[PDB]
Scaffold this active site. Structure first.
Site, PDB file in Angstrom:
ATOM      1  N   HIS A 146       5.371   2.677  -0.631  1.00 51.14           N
ATOM      2  CA  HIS A 146       6.783   2.335  -0.676  1.00 51.14           C
ATOM      3  C   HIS A 146       7.600   3.592  -0.922  1.00 51.14           C
ATOM      4  CE1 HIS A 146       7.598   2.588  -5.114  1.00 51.14           C
ATOM      5  NE2 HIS A 146       6.278   2.548  -5.121  1.00 51.14           N
TER       6      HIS A 146
ATOM      7  N   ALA B 174      11.888   2.545   2.661  1.00 50.94           N
ATOM      8  CA  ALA B 174      10.850   1.911   3.458  1.00 50.94           C
ATOM      9  C   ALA B 174       9.823   1.264   2.544  1.00 50.94           C
ATOM     10  CB  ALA B 174      10.163   2.914   4.389  1.00 50.94           C
TER      11      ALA B 174
ATOM     12  N   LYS C 257       5.183  -1.131   8.365  1.00 54.33           N
ATOM     13  CA  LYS C 257       6.315  -0.515   7.685  1.00 54.33           C
ATOM     14  C   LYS C 257       7.569  -1.344   7.930  1.00 54.33           C
ATOM     15  CE  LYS C 257       7.771   4.138   6.651  1.00 54.33           C
ATOM     16  NZ  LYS C 257       8.275   5.460   7.109  1.00 54.33           N
TER      17      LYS C 257
ATOM     18  N   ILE D 269       0.810  -1.210   0.000  1.00 55.60           N
ATOM     19  CA  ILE D 269       0.000   0.000   0.000  1.00 55.60           C
ATOM     20  C   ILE D 269       0.846   1.262   0.000  1.00 55.60           C
ATOM     21  CG2 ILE D 269      -1.859  -1.228   1.181  1.00 55.60           C
ATOM     22  CD1 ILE D 269      -1.085  -0.010   3.736  1.00 55.60           C
TER      23      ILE D 269
ATOM     24  N   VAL E 187       5.720  -0.506   2.837  1.00 54.68           N
ATOM     25  CA  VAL E 187       4.521  -0.517   3.670  1.00 54.68           C
ATOM     26  C   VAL E 187       3.529  -1.518   3.098  1.00 54.68           C
ATOM     27  CG1 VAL E 187       2.801   0.876   4.853  1.00 54.68           C
ATOM     28  CG2 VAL E 187       4.913   1.947   4.047  1.00 54.68           C
TER      29      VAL E 187
ATOM     30  N   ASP F  34      10.120  16.169   5.248  1.00 51.96           N
ATOM     31  CA  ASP F  34       9.692  15.366   4.104  1.00 51.96           C
ATOM     32  C   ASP F  34       8.192  15.525   3.880  1.00 51.96           C
ATOM     33  OD1 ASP F  34      10.312  13.861   1.918  1.00 51.96           O
ATOM     34  OD2 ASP F  34      10.193  11.922   2.947  1.00 51.96           O
TER      35      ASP F  34
END
Ligand SMILES: O=C(NCC(F)(F)F)c1cc(-c2cnc3[nH]c(C4=CCCNC4)cc3c2)cs1
Length: 274
Positions: free
Chosen positions: A17, A21, A39, A15, A23, A131
């Site tokens: 990325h 990382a 995550k 769902i 997810v 971010d």
């Protein structure tokens, strides 16, 4: 299937990325209707993904807010780290903008009110996000994934780049998305919490016009444009209400010394209920 504590998830249920990382959708082992987002490490950047995931755990342990993605549980070990986080049925803001193209001023105000509330906590704790972008803005609608966008709850996510910044200190680490970082960040200059405010104003501009305020072909071209133009003129449409006009012009100031500050942002007339 994989298990993390009292939760379980399956790969290929992706769902979300990033470069550092990954997810997946997950659920409680007992209550299967309880949805969570797990995550994990992006194996493409193993060493750094571990570090950023660990930093996000330490940050989110201190940031509990209705408009900040919740951290239900986590598991830090020597060779792996996992985060059991809140699931948002509405997806991220980038997907919503790709479908709605543009948002109403009332919808923007509702979103900005929640972001401002979350930012009020970050500011009081001395934390900067670094971010902020539509992909890191999550949407949750309690009345159904297709219900009224008037009841959408907004959550700020992805705190791996976040850091504490003392009130008399400046940061200098280059991170974030080039399209959304303040001119001082991309031009390799010192910066403070006002860099996030440029990112927010850029997001608000994108929700209003459907496009970024300052176009460029590459990050290098964007930084050359920021260098060449000592002043920045964001084009705001004529139909824009006067309070939203002043908010965008003061958030998208090139020089952070001239940019809007937090106190004037938290109490801006545009956020005041109409
Ligand atoms: O940090 C994060 N992302 C940064 C990076 F770099 F890791 F990607 C986090 C993202 C989430 C989260 C929570 N809920 C979600 N729902 C959906 C749906 C997609 C389409 C169908 N509709 C729902 C996606 C989704 C992601 C928790 S944390």
């Amino acid at each position: 299937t994989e298990t993390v504590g009292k939760f379980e998830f399956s790969r290929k249920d992706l769902i979300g990325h990033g470069a550092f990382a990954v997810v997946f959708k997950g659920r409680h082992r007992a209550a299967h209707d309880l949805e969570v987002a797990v995550k994990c490490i992006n194996k493409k950047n193993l060493a750094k993904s571990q570090t950023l995931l660990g930093k996000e755990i330490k940050i989110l342990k201190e940031l509990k807010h209705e408009n900040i993605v919740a951290l239900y549980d986590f598991q830090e070990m020597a060779n792996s780290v996992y985060l059991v986080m809140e699931y948002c049925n509405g997806g991220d803001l980038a997907d919503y903008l790709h479908a709605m193209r543009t948002l109403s001023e009332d919808t923007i105000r509702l979103f900005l009110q929640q972001i401002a509330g979350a930012m009020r906590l970050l500011h009081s704790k001395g934390i900067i996000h670094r971010d902020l972008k539509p992909q890191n803005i999550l949407l949750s609608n309690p009345a159904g994934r297709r219900a009224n966008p008037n009841s959408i709850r907004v959550k700020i996510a992805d705190f791996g780049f976040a850091r504490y910044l003392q009130s008399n200190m400046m940061a200098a680490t280059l991170c974030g998305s080039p399209m959304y970082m303040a001119p001082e960040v991309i031009m390799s200059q010192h910066y403070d919490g006002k860099a996030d405010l440029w990112s927010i104003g850029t997001i608000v501009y994108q929700c209003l016009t459907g496009k970024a305020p300052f176009q460029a072909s590459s990050p290098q071209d964007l930084r050359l444009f920021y260098e060449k133009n000592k002043t920045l003129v964001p084009t705001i449409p004529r139909e824009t209400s006067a309070p939203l006009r002043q908010l965008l012009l003061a958030l998208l100031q090139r020089n952070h010394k001239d940019r809007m500050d937090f106190d004037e942002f938290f109490h801006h007339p545009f956020l005041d209920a109409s």
